[PDB]
Scaffold this active site. Structure first.
Site, PDB file in Angstrom:
ATOM      1  N   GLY A   7       0.798  -1.236   0.000  1.00 36.71           N
ATOM      2  CA  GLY A   7       0.000   0.000   0.000  1.00 36.71           C
ATOM      3  C   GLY A   7       0.821   1.272   0.000  1.00 36.71           C
ATOM      4  O   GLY A   7       0.337   2.353   0.385  1.00 36.71           O
ATOM      5  N   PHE A  11      -2.344   7.016   0.526  1.00 35.53           N
ATOM      6  CA  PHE A  11      -2.132   8.283   1.204  1.00 35.53           C
ATOM      7  C   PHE A  11      -1.147   8.118   2.397  1.00 35.53           C
ATOM      8  O   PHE A  11      -0.060   8.732   2.431  1.00 35.53           O
ATOM      9  CB  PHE A  11      -3.486   8.805   1.654  1.00 35.53           C
ATOM     10  CG  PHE A  11      -3.422  10.102   2.361  1.00 35.53           C
ATOM     11  CD1 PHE A  11      -2.884  11.218   1.742  1.00 35.53           C
ATOM     12  CD2 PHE A  11      -3.911  10.226   3.645  1.00 35.53           C
ATOM     13  CE1 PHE A  11      -2.824  12.452   2.401  1.00 35.53           C
ATOM     14  CE2 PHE A  11      -3.857  11.454   4.303  1.00 35.53           C
ATOM     15  CZ  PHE A  11      -3.309  12.566   3.672  1.00 35.53           C
ATOM     16  N   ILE A  12      -1.498   7.257   3.352  1.00 32.99           N
ATOM     17  CA  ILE A  12      -0.608   6.982   4.481  1.00 32.99           C
ATOM     18  C   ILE A  12       0.647   6.236   4.044  1.00 32.99           C
ATOM     19  O   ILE A  12       1.759   6.481   4.528  1.00 32.99           O
ATOM     20  CB  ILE A  12      -1.361   6.165   5.611  1.00 32.99           C
ATOM     21  CG1 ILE A  12      -2.447   7.032   6.240  1.00 32.99           C
ATOM     22  CG2 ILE A  12      -0.391   5.591   6.682  1.00 32.99           C
ATOM     23  CD1 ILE A  12      -1.927   8.327   6.844  1.00 32.99           C
ATOM     24  N   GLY A  13       0.456   5.269   3.172  1.00 28.97           N
ATOM     25  CA  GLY A  13       1.551   4.446   2.702  1.00 28.97           C
ATOM     26  C   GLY A  13       2.713   5.232   2.109  1.00 28.97           C
ATOM     27  O   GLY A  13       3.863   4.857   2.348  1.00 28.97           O
ATOM     28  N   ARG A  32       1.011  -3.757  -7.574  1.00 26.30           N
ATOM     29  CA  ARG A  32       0.042  -4.456  -8.409  1.00 26.30           C
ATOM     30  C   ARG A  32       0.603  -4.522  -9.815  1.00 26.30           C
ATOM     31  O   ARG A  32       1.024  -3.499 -10.356  1.00 26.30           O
ATOM     32  CB  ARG A  32      -1.273  -3.666  -8.433  1.00 26.30           C
ATOM     33  CG  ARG A  32      -2.438  -4.293  -9.190  1.00 26.30           C
ATOM     34  CD  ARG A  32      -3.713  -3.429  -9.055  1.00 26.30           C
ATOM     35  NE  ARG A  32      -4.056  -3.133  -7.657  1.00 26.30           N
ATOM     36  CZ  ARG A  32      -4.783  -3.910  -6.844  1.00 26.30           C
ATOM     37  NH1 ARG A  32      -5.290  -5.072  -7.258  1.00 26.30           N
ATOM     38  NH2 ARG A  32      -5.003  -3.524  -5.590  1.00 26.30           N
ATOM     39  N   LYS A 130     -10.996  -4.757  11.055  1.00 27.35           N
ATOM     40  CA  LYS A 130      -9.688  -4.536  11.685  1.00 27.35           C
ATOM     41  C   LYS A 130      -9.489  -5.400  12.938  1.00 27.35           C
ATOM     42  O   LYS A 130      -8.390  -5.949  13.164  1.00 27.35           O
ATOM     43  CB  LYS A 130      -9.457  -3.052  11.938  1.00 27.35           C
ATOM     44  CG  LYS A 130      -9.293  -2.228  10.654  1.00 27.35           C
ATOM     45  CD  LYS A 130      -8.865  -0.791  10.928  1.00 27.35           C
ATOM     46  CE  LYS A 130      -8.660  -0.028   9.613  1.00 27.35           C
ATOM     47  NZ  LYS A 130      -7.859   1.226   9.847  1.00 27.35           N
TER      48      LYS A 130
HETATM   49  N1  NDP Z   1      -6.599  10.261   9.560  1.00 28.45           N
HETATM   50  C1  NDP Z   1      -6.194   9.009   9.684  1.00 28.45           C
HETATM   51  O1  NDP Z   1      -5.589   8.597  10.681  1.00 28.45           O
HETATM   52  C2  NDP Z   1      -6.427   8.092   8.468  1.00 28.45           C
HETATM   53  C3  NDP Z   1      -6.016   6.826   8.508  1.00 28.45           C
HETATM   54  N2  NDP Z   1      -6.200   5.981   7.387  1.00 28.45           N
HETATM   55  C4  NDP Z   1      -6.134   4.481   7.511  1.00 28.45           C
HETATM   56  O2  NDP Z   1      -4.950   4.209   6.773  1.00 28.45           O
HETATM   57  C5  NDP Z   1      -5.066   2.909   6.129  1.00 28.45           C
HETATM   58  C6  NDP Z   1      -4.687   3.184   4.701  1.00 28.45           C
HETATM   59  O3  NDP Z   1      -5.717   3.973   4.090  1.00 28.45           O
HETATM   60  P1  NDP Z   1      -5.346   4.998   2.857  1.00 28.45           P
HETATM   61  O4  NDP Z   1      -4.029   5.653   3.030  1.00 28.45           O
HETATM   62  O5  NDP Z   1      -6.627   5.905   2.739  1.00 28.45           O
HETATM   63  O6  NDP Z   1      -5.521   3.933   1.627  1.00 28.45           O
HETATM   64  P2  NDP Z   1      -5.282   4.124   0.057  1.00 28.45           P
HETATM   65  O7  NDP Z   1      -6.542   3.686  -0.651  1.00 28.45           O
HETATM   66  O8  NDP Z   1      -4.775   5.669  -0.166  1.00 28.45           O
HETATM   67  O9  NDP Z   1      -3.986   3.224  -0.261  1.00 28.45           O
HETATM   68  C7  NDP Z   1      -4.083   1.834  -0.230  1.00 28.45           C
HETATM   69  C8  NDP Z   1      -2.858   1.196  -0.765  1.00 28.45           C
HETATM   70  O10 NDP Z   1      -3.154  -0.244  -0.591  1.00 28.45           O
HETATM   71  C9  NDP Z   1      -2.865  -0.866  -1.901  1.00 28.45           C
HETATM   72  N3  NDP Z   1      -3.586  -2.138  -1.929  1.00 28.45           N
HETATM   73  C10 NDP Z   1      -4.893  -2.293  -1.714  1.00 28.45           C
HETATM   74  N4  NDP Z   1      -5.192  -3.592  -1.784  1.00 28.45           N
HETATM   75  C11 NDP Z   1      -4.065  -4.270  -2.028  1.00 28.45           C
HETATM   76  C12 NDP Z   1      -3.773  -5.624  -2.203  1.00 28.45           C
HETATM   77  N5  NDP Z   1      -4.736  -6.544  -2.114  1.00 28.45           N
HETATM   78  N6  NDP Z   1      -2.500  -5.987  -2.454  1.00 28.45           N
HETATM   79  C13 NDP Z   1      -1.535  -5.072  -2.516  1.00 28.45           C
HETATM   80  N7  NDP Z   1      -1.771  -3.765  -2.339  1.00 28.45           N
HETATM   81  C14 NDP Z   1      -3.037  -3.348  -2.108  1.00 28.45           C
HETATM   82  C15 NDP Z   1      -3.323   0.190  -2.904  1.00 28.45           C
HETATM   83  O11 NDP Z   1      -2.727  -0.086  -4.173  1.00 28.45           O
HETATM   84  P3  NDP Z   1      -3.675   0.080  -5.548  1.00 28.45           P
HETATM   85  O12 NDP Z   1      -3.994   1.516  -5.762  1.00 28.45           O
HETATM   86  O13 NDP Z   1      -2.806  -0.634  -6.672  1.00 28.45           O
HETATM   87  O14 NDP Z   1      -4.972  -0.791  -5.296  1.00 28.45           O
HETATM   88  C16 NDP Z   1      -2.681   1.431  -2.287  1.00 28.45           C
HETATM   89  O15 NDP Z   1      -1.279   1.498  -2.658  1.00 28.45           O
HETATM   90  C17 NDP Z   1      -6.479   2.429   6.348  1.00 28.45           C
HETATM   91  O16 NDP Z   1      -6.485   1.539   7.460  1.00 28.45           O
HETATM   92  C18 NDP Z   1      -7.201   3.704   6.744  1.00 28.45           C
HETATM   93  O17 NDP Z   1      -8.235   3.353   7.641  1.00 28.45           O
HETATM   94  C19 NDP Z   1      -6.221   6.589   6.103  1.00 28.45           C
HETATM   95  C20 NDP Z   1      -6.714   7.814   5.975  1.00 28.45           C
HETATM   96  C21 NDP Z   1      -7.119   8.623   7.202  1.00 28.45           C
END
Ligand code: NDP
Length: 302
Positions: A7, A11-13, A32, A130
């Site tokens: 990931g 955004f966080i990643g 991916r 979760k």
């Molecule tokens: N304010 C806060 O504290 C916040 C916390 N969060 C939490 O952070 C975590 C991440 O969320 P966020 O940053 O929004 O997520 P994103 O949708 O921005 O990023 C997700 C990443 O996961 C990858 N991914 C998803 N599925 C797979 C898979 N099966 N295999 C490999 N890679 C995968 C996506 O790749 P691809 O695009 O290729 O699918 C992408 O790189 C979540 O738990 C969210 O709840 C996030 C935002 C607000």
């Protein structure tokens, strides 16, 4: 200690991956397979230029993940997958259990303490997923760290990043505290935890005291930055519950978490003095968090 991040284009990643590379940690980024979006292209290039090793696969493919963890001798796995993909982590956990060599797993947490917080639906469903992942991790005997970093330092809109220029929507009384953390600090401090003896099998809470603000205070910081005051209007608890009740994904999820934070005080209403909870600022003393003022300063430069 070789780190695999799933990931990293998220955004966080992006913050976690950059921090890992800036810490001079050997860092592998799961991608991916296929054609690349302009923004994904941008992110992957930046990370490779910092020394990231790209590996191709998807975390829901257990056999594939076993091969990657083995072939690349991975020590530390960090998942930052999105809310829609939380149960994709199940195969990853089974893979880590099978290989047996993982020293630390950080599942896709990065917000509240899902075991203490009780949001309304559909936020609750996400927390159910979760919690199910945490149950699986613990029963699998995988050493873990749960990053409970509270809110990213952006303006908390109910449907959600840039603060308002017209009027402020204040939830409830606007007198409920939350913790706001810069993206770069979520990455930096997350990566410090991955091999700290003190974060092993712990929940890590981010409670920077200078960034503990209620919505009224957050509004005032923005007014200082724009050099003018704006009208304030109330968004009631029932407004947020109505929005949550529509079950529109992900908007209603964001509404449910807004309610939990700003109506029910979910980030601040528990003690972290117990033996399974640690707090970032006491783990890493004399290592200041970026303030909200500073963060809002760069929104101004946009
Ligand atoms: N304010 C806060 O504290 C916040 C916390 N969060 C939490 O952070 C975590 C991440 O969320 P966020 O940053 O929004 O997520 P994103 O949708 O921005 O990023 C997700 C990443 O996961 C990858 N991914 C998803 N599925 C797979 C898979 N099966 N295999 C490999 N890679 C995968 C996506 O790749 P691809 O695009 O290729 O699918 C992408 O790189 C979540 O738990 C969210 O709840 C996030 C935002 C607000």
């Amino acid at each position: 200690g070789r780190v695999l991040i799933a990931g990293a284009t998220g955004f966080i990643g992006q913050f976690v991956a950059t921090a890992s590379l800036d810490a001079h940690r050997p860092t592998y980024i799961l991608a991916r397979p296929g054609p690349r979006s302009p923004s994904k292209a941008k992110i992957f290039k930046a990370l490779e230029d910092k020394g990231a090793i790209i590996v191709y696969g998807l975390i829901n493919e257990q056999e594939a993940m076993e091969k990657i963890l083995k072939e690349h001798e991975i020590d530390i796995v960090v998942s930052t997958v999105g809310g829609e993909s939380i149960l994709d982590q199940i195969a990853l956990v089974k893979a880590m259990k099978a290989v047996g060599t993982i020293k630390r797993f950080l599942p896709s947490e990065f917000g509240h303490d899902v075991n203490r917080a009780d949001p309304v639906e559909p936020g609750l469903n996400m927390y159910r997923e979760k919690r199910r992942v945490r149950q699986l991790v613990e029963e699998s005997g995988i050493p873990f760290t749960y990053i409970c970093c509270n809110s990213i330092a952006s303006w908390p809109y109910y449907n959600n990043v840039l603060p308002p220029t017209d009027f402020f929507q204040i939830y409830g009384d606007g007198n409920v505290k939350a913790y706001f953390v810069a993206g770069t600090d979520i990455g930096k401090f997350t990566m410090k935890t991955v091999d700290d003896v003190r974060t092993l099998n712990k929940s890590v809470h981010f409670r920077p005291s200078c960034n503990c603000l209620n919505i009224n205070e957050l509004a005032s910081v923005w007014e200082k930055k724009i050099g003018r005051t704006l009208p304030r209007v109330t968004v009631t608890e029932d407004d947020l519950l109505a929005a949550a009740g529509e079950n529109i994904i992900p908007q209603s999820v964001v509404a449910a978490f807004t309610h939990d934070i700003f109506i029910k005080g979910c980030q601040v209403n528990f003690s972290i003095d117990g033996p399974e909870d640690v707090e970032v600022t006491t783990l890493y003393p004399e290592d200041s968090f970026r303030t909200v003022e500073e963060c809002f300063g760069e929104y101004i430069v946009k």
